[PDB]
Write a protein that binds this DNA or RNA. Structure first.
Length: 1326
RNA sequence: CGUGUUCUAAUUGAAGGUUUUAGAGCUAGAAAUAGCAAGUUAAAAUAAGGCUAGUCCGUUAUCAACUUGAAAAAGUGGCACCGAGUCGGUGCUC
DNA sequence: CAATACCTCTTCAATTAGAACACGG
DNA sequence: TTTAGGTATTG
């Protein structure tokens, strides 16, 4: 006789229970435990809060990291295992010192000095070769045998930090001189293209190409010197290509299909080559000439140093940085001595202040130290060159800085190679292992290979040819690499909804194509002059149509049918076709795709070869990497010409279908012995449809399927709640709410509800890049003209201006950067139709009156001027298809009366699909009973509501919601949603299809919805009491019921249950604190004394536990008795559970009482004394446990007082509210008295409270809007949970935390329900 | 069907940061002190660590209590009424 | 004791897959 | 992107 309404949010879940007259019931419960009480009475409405659920994204980037860090450790491992024999010969302990290089001299086992043991020599190496990049030049240059331990020393370093694989190819650093290389291209292109000849013109190609200027520009700067060549003309692309780019010369050679080329991209050498043959072999020389330049320029940025001396440029550059520090370090210090020597300690000796002494020795970034000395360099004179260097960002470089990593790995490998070649003569073992050693630097598992697991990884999927250990060297052979690649993908791709078991067919499969075609053809009607009835296409006719027309054309069209087949074959001079649009919707595209590739039409037609064409496409869809693609294209390799095969690889396919293969031809109807495809071709008489067939009872197809949906019988609840497409947090809530219902029903005597009413409610650097790119494609200097910062664009009217590129969207005029305030944000589509605050639906222009009518999308006039302008933006990606299409819409017709009706509806019916399964799951769990007909006995209605019913209802009925006062409102919001949705479908059963779950003309529809919520009101002239005119049933009573709502709303006691959740996650703050004398510090590794070595700190605690036990005090070690809290940290927790006592004793607690220990999750609740209540938060601290049941009038009063966004109300009413603000303006004192009395009673943090009071007291003069909003601010001290910062108008009130758990220890412990209804109460004295 | 954004799940890379150690500091001066020279680099751990010993796994999800289960998860607590500062009383069942 | 006041690893690359949602045709 | 438990500091 009751109904349950619930609110499901990210962090909260609101529930309620309602009588037959919208009252809320009031039951007396039991209370297990030792306390005197044996029952308590509580209301039937409330909210269960919790911590927001957390996504796996951080954890995965952890998962990734750990797999990542160790592999790098492994590379440093293979060098040693290569080296071990020859290193012991040379040195016994070199490797041992390195492993133990970290340990303290006292704990050091071998000689402290890693490289040579001796103190004297190590000093020597460090001063001939002071930075490891001084050593890296030597052994790529020197032709004199060198100490092996220096050689390994070089090698690991490159391997440990190796360079990025963004670019894959081979680099011959014979490319140092760009001018020479470029000039050589001018030559070979002239020879190729005698008719139009370039002139080199003495461009500082090295100078032009070399420069930092943006990549697109340089090719422009180069073509600005040429005497009159087009940018996109053949030369231009080539030039553009060497600089990393993906130009296109398809337009100069008019290839039918676009021919796009990146040197960097893996698919280049063939790609040009696959292309190159097609333009003649002659050019091929031209591109290589281009690559050779690319190599010389490509590396240009890492070193501008003359190539000619050095075969190891990148490292040589670092030597350069070192020298350019030294003399600028002498000259700075020297200059400071020359002027302002007095302030010289701060700059160098003192770490703290960002001084150079800070820079080397303190936590001072390169950007933190460059902006410290900026005044000083300026303030000083004679430093002018110095200033120039800094502005360049070159002032005092360090060898490791954030940027490196635009160093490709192929010079780090360019330099590994030079060393081995250099010294393999001295040492035979290198030539034996040069390949291995290079392969260590070279080798990266691909993504599709996955973790090299052996059956123990939830994550990995690869499969093994040989079970021997995998080493970079043996890799291809051990891993079933291709097969593994098909495994990568076949776990993230779909299964048929109809058939769970069969994995979905790829999109470009011929069979889907013979299915789509034969299906769209099944309902073609045709008529001619002679016939009585227009009739279906016959089986003979369809096959004839598919074979002739479709197999001959990509697209088959209506008059292709009329004249090509009927006239040609059936000779109907003229015909009428009912079935189709201008052309058939499907096409036999894949059939056509192939015909071009292999040119054997009968082959495609032949049935026997048909499983090849699906295992061609399943392999062509399935794979990304062209080398990978080849492997399974060998299996069918024998038949085709070699020339085709090369062609075959290129046309890769994408996307996947929804239909399987046993469906389309998989299953056979028993009586008729035909599969759907069979059915589709040749259903005699009526031509049944896929949909039809799947519901033809006469047919077995529905029946057979029936088993398929059933198999596995669904899955248990979280197994299902964790597969719904949505927020991780939202799913957590979805679960929690059902755990509420099964109680609320359990509570209501296991009596199922009449109605269950559900609601759900609804980047800093992202803005920077999108603009960054957009201007670049646009090429405007507007970004240059005015620059801005990454922290600035959370303000739209600023941010919008940039996407619009400083021009009026509706006006074609430039914009005032400074006075954005005068201008107006305009939402393209009016808010009344839809509520959109997105960058997608907003625009900024001076006046929002130039778009057009208030009541429509921007006017035809607006589109005409700037439709074109809107294209530059879309291409720039400065706007979007959603943003664009609406903007251009008016030429599509402005929103039709049909459109408007649609928006007004969607405000009220929830079409959000995440809120659907949730609705569905309730129905399924709730209604299990089955009637004699297959039909379902729906005994609980489910209802989904949009927020706007309830949110508006408070606005129009004096039920205002102030979130800030209390956590209560999340619970009122079920109640309202309960009675709203119950009373709705008691007046309009017709809407039950829309509002409840289970199976032009618009203008009126607009009316029907807009006024739907009228009936509650007395005047809009409505009768007080509502009814169903059909059933003679009462639904509403304006007088009695409204009063009831107020009675429910202001109820003093609501159930508010912070979920007790055990803490999880990282053990402690990731930061590694320096060695300290603290027992707080945690030893980073099991041997490493943090007093000695440094450690972590700040461990989080998965749950605390009360030990009532004894410890010894004093020399006597007398055993006293304690009862304290011991938090068990998350490193510790695993250890605890194996045995607590042994673990507990270890801490030193003695004669621990085994039975007494009680696990306490974070957020546990104790009520001590006055009814002041507290939630555990950490072992040492507790949280505000109390809620404020503010009498409503104060709740109502404030909402108006804050006066949010001024007033949105209808004008006459606004007068009505105001007097009451100041009739009851004295209420403000009442509120403070309400906080003031309560704060004294429960919050119990007086030291602050006087402080708070005073702020209000001296601000009595200030207006209510000011004072009024702020009092709302002041609620923050009050609120359930943990202290945070807050202020009155300018006065900031710091928090007061609760610093020990002692006061809990002889107090009540409350273990409540998932609802707060059932409790068990524990008086802690013992 | 086409397209596009957004968000989620997985995999495979790069660059910094941090932490002890190694880069013979000197000149005075009994000393705290005070004069100047030096600084740019490397090694190593990078969740403690687990057994299934992999170039594997190690921060998501799920969690009142009590009886019971390995775990999953099943089982446990009268009703009415009048009233309201976090549930208080009444009558009834019991 | 419990009042104040500081601290909290970061920023980039590449590849697949699928909902969900909103424009067009 | 800011909270809200851990840390040692000062009165």
């Amino acid at each position: 006789k009751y109904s349950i309404g619930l609110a499901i949010g990210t962090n909260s879940v609101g529930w309620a229970v309602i009588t037959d007259e919208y009252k809320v019931p009031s039951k007396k419960f039991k209370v297990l435990g030792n306390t005197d009480r044996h029952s308590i009475k509580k209301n039937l409405i409330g909210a269960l809060l919790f911590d927001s659920g957390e996504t796996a994204e951080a954890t995965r980037l952890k998962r990734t990291a750990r797999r990542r860090y160790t592999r790098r450790k492994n590379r440093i491992c293979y060098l040693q295992e290569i080296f071990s024999n020859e290193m012991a010969k040379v040195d016994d302990s070199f490797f041992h010192r390195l492993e133990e290089s970290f340990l303290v001299e006292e704990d050091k086992k071998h000689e402290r000095h890693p490289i040579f043991g001796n103190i004297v020599d190590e000093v020597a190496y460090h001063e001939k070769y002071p930075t490891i990049y001084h050593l890296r030049k030597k052994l790529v240059d020197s032709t004199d045998k060198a100490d092996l331990r220096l050689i390994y020393l070089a090698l690991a370093h490159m391997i440990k930090f190796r360079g990025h694989f963004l670019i894959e190819g081979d680099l011959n650093p014979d490319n140092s001189d760009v001018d020479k290389l470029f000039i050589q291209l001018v030559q070979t292109y002239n020879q190729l293209f005698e008719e139009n000849p370039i002139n080199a013109s003495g461009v500082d190609a090295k100078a032009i190409l070399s420069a930092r200027l943006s990549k697109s520009r340089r090719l422009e700067n180069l073509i600005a010197q040429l005497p009159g060549e087009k940018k996109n003309g053949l030369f231009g692309n080539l030039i553009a290509l060497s600089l990393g780019l993906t130009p296109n010369f398809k337009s100069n050679f008019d290839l039918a299909e676009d021919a796009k080329l990146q040197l960097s991209k893996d698919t280049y050498d063939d790609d040009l080559d696959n292309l190159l043959a097609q333009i003649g072999d002659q050019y091929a020389d031209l591109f290589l000439a281009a690559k050779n330049l690319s190599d010389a320029i490509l590396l240009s940025d890492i070193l501008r140093v003359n190539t000619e001396i050095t075969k190891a440029p990148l490292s040589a550059s670092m030597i350069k940085r070192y020298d350019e520090h030294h003399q600028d370090l002498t000259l700075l210090k020297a200059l400071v001595r020359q002027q302002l020597p007095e302030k010289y300690k701060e700059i160098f000796f003192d770490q703290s202040k960002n001084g150079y002494a800070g820079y080397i020795d303190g936590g001072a970034s390169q950007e933190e130290f460059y902006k410290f000395i900026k005044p000083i360099l300026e303030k000083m004179d004679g430093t002018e060159e110095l200033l120039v260097k800094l502005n360049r960002e070159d002032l005092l470089r360090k060898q490791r800085t954030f940027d490196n990593g635009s160093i490709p790995h192929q010079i780090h490998l360019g330099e590994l190679h030079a060393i081995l070649r250099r010294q393999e003569d001295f040492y035979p073992f290198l030539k034996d292992n040069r390949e291995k050693i290079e392969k260590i630097l070279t080798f990266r598992i691909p993504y599709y290979v996955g973790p090299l697991a052996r059956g123990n990884s939830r994550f990995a999927w690869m499969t093994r040819k040989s079970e021997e250990t995998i080493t970079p060297w043996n890799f291809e052979e051990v891993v079933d690499k291709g097969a593994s690649a098909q495994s990568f993908i076949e776990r993230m791709t779909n299964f048929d909804k109809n058939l769970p078991n069969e994995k979905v067919l790829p999109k470009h499969s011929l069979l889907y194509e013979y299915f789509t075609v034969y299906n769209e053809l099944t309902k073609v009607k045709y008529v001619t002059e002679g016939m009585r009835k227009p009739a279906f296409l016959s089986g003979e006719q369809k096959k004839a149509i598919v074979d002739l027309l479709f197999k001959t054309n990509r697209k088959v069209t209506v008059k292709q049918l009329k004249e090509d087949y009927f006239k040609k074959i059936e000779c109907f001079d003229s015909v009428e076709i009912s079935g189709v649009e201008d052309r058939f919707n499907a096409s036999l595209g894949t059939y056509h795709d192939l015909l071009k590739i292999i040119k054997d039409k009968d082959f495609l037609d032949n049935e026997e070869n048909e499983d090849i064409l699906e295992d061609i496409v399943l392999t062509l869809t399935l794979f990304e990497d062209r080398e990978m693609i080849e492997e399974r294209l060998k299996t069918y390799a024998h038949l085709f010409d070699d020339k085709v095969m090369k062609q075959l690889k290129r046309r890769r396919y994408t996307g996947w279908g929804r239909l399987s293969r046993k469906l389309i031809n998989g299953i056979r109807d028993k009586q008729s012995g035909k599969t759907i495809l069979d059915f589709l071709k040749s259903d005699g008489f009526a031509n049944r449809n896929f949909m039809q067939l799947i519901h033809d009872d006469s047919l077995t197809f529905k029946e057979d399927i029936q088993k398929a949906q059933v198999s596995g019988q669904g899955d248990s609840l979280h197994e299902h709640i964790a597969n719904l497409a949505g927020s991780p947090a939202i799913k957590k809530g979805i679960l929690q709410t059902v755990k509420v219902v099964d109680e609320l029903v359990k509570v209501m005597g296991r009596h199922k509800p009449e109605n269950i009413v559900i609601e759900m409610a609804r980047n800093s650097r992202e803005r920077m890049k999108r603009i960054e790119e957009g201007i670049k494609e646009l090429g405007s200097q507007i970004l240059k003209e005015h620059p801005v910062e990454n922290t600035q664009l959370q303000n739209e009217k600023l941010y919008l201006y940039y996407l619009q590129n400083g021009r009026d969207m509706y006006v074609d005029q430039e914009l005032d950067i400074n006075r954005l305030s005068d201008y107006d944000v305009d939402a393209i589509v009016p808010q009344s139709f839809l509520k959109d605050d997105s960058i997608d639906n907003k625009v900024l222009t001076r006046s929002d009156k130039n778009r057009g009518k208030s009541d429509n999308v921007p006017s035809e006039e607006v589109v005409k001027k700037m439709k074109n302008y809107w294209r530059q933006l879309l291409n720039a990606k400065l706007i979007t298809q959603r943003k664009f299409d609406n903007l251009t819409k008016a030429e599509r017709g402005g929103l039709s009366e049909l459109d408007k009706a649609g928006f007004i509806k969607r405000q009220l019916v929830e079409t959000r699909q995440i809120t659907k399964h949730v609705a569905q799951i309730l129905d399924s769990r709730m209604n299990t009973k089955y009637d004699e007909n297959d039909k379902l006995i729906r005994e609980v209605k489910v209802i989904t509501l949009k927020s706007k019913l309830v949110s508006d209802f408070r606005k129009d009925f004096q039920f205002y919601k102030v979130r800030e006062i209390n956590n209560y409102h999340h619970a009122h919001d079920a109640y309202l949603n309960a009675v709203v949705g119950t009373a709705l479908i008691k007046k309009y059963p017709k809407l039950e299809s829309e509002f409840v779950y289970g199976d032009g003309k618009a203008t009126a529809k607009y009316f029907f919805y807009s006024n739907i919520m009228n009936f509650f009101k007395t005047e809009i002239k409505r009768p007080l009491i509502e009814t169903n005119g059909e059933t003679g049933e009462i639904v509403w009573d304006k007088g009695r019921d409204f009063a009831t709502v107020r009675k429910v709303l202001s109820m003093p006691q609501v159930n508010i249950v912070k979920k007790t959740e055990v803490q999880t996650g990282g053990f402690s703050k990731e930061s590694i604190l320096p060695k300290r004398n603290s027992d707080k510090l945690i030893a980073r590794k099991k041997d490493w004394d943090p007093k000695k070595y440094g450690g972590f700190d700040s461990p989080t605690v998965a749950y605390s536990v009360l030990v009532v036990a004894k410890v010894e005090k004093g020399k006597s070690k007398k055993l006293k008795s304690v009862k304290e809290l011991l938090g068990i940290t998350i490193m510790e927790r695993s250890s605890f559970e194996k045995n607590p006592i042994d673990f507990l004793e270890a801490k030193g607690y003695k004669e621990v009482k085994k039975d007494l220990i009680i696990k306490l999750p974070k957020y546990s609740l104790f009520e001590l004394e006055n009814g002041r209540k507290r939630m555990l938060a950490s072992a040492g601290e507790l949280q505000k446990g109390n809620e404020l049941a503010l009498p409503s009038k104060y709740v109502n009063f404030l909402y108006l007082a804050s006066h949010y966004e001024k007033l949105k109300g209808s004008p006459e009413d606004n007068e009505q509210k105001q007097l009451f603000v100041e009739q009851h303006k004295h209420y403000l004192d009442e509120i403070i008295e309400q906080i003031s009395e309560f704060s004294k009673r429960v919050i119990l943090a007086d030291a602050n409270l006087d402080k708070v009071l005073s702020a209000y007291n001296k601000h009595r003069d200030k207006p209510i809007r000011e004072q009024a909003e702020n009092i709302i601010h002041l609620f923050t001290l009050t609120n359930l949970g943990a202290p945070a910062a807050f202020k009155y108008f300018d006065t900031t009130i710091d928090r007061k935390r609760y610093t020990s758990t002692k006061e809990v220890l002889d107090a009540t412990l409350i273990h409540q329900s998932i609802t707060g209804l059932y409790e068990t109460r524990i008086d802690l004295s013992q």
